[PDB]
């Protein structure tokens, strides 16, 4: 909790991701950079913005719609993009 | 009588007690923190007419006196298992 308070950001590595094949196991939802895109080349800046937000919200849809065992068209399109970028 | 925060009296008593080097107990409150609120609140009473007459040397005879108390406490996250609550 001290070093999280001092630093400019956090990469969180998770064993549940590392065990499910997701190596490197960075958790997108809980990891942040306090400078962000101001430290990117501008090409990467465009592409990056879409990817992070789509992944974290895809995580919500995947939990919701699996136990519900359910489908809707835009949600389906979103979900199988989110799995493909993941 | 309304005591607006008995939680803030326990915290003030904890502060002053630790600065006097008294041994701490659970949640660092001193050992006698129950005796603090217990002797406070048990003064809130109804007293019969014979007590009033004896106290006031007969200047009042028929009436029964009382003091009702509404202490306030603040819980954290709805936890009632904390020491003071």
């Amino acid at each position: 909790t001290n070093v999280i308070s001092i630093t400019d950001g956090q990469i969180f590595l998770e064993t549940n991701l590392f065990n499910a094949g997701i190596r490197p196991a960075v958790n997108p939802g809980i990891s942040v950079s306090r400078v962000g895109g101001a430290a990117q080349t501008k090409i990467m800046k465009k592409l990056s913005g879409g990817i992070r937000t789509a992944l974290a919200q895809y995580r919500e849809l995947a939990a919701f719609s699996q136990f519900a065992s359910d489908l809707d068209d835009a949600t389906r399109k979103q979900l199988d993009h989110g799995q493909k970028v993941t | 009588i309304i005591y607006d925060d008995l939680s803030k009296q326990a915290v003030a008593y904890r502060q002053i007690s630790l600065l006097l080097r008294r041994p701490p107990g659970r949640e660092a409150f001193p050992g006698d923190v129950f005796y603090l609120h217990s002797r406070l609140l048990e003064r809130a009473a109804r007293v019969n007419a014979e007590y009033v007459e004896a106290f006031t040397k007969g200047e009042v005879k028929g009436k029964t006196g009382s003091l009702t108390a509404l202490p306030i406490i603040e819980t954290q996250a709805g936890d009632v298992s904390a020491f003071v609550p």
Partner: protein
Amino acid sequence: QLDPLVVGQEHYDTARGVQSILQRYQELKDIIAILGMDELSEEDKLVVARARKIQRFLSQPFFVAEVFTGSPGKYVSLKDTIRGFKGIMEGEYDHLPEQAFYMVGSIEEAVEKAKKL
């Protein structure tokens, strides 16, 4: 300062209405994972629809955060944000997609975003 007297009933009843919907959504949200929306009722389906779109309309882009986002910052006046939340509260413009409420700022831009998509 969220007192009916000062803020006027206009603001107070709008705020308490939003708060009451979002608490009802949080109660449903857990058992929705068990029930989906299939076994939820029609009374629930309107409330969740209003709640999600209200919870999108609470977002805003900041002039500071254009660095992070590329989108320009927005400013929204008190009267306008009351009009927008009461507009979903009473007007219930579920005509519009859920992202039409998100990061837009003003009520007019929210409908215009839905007019564009």
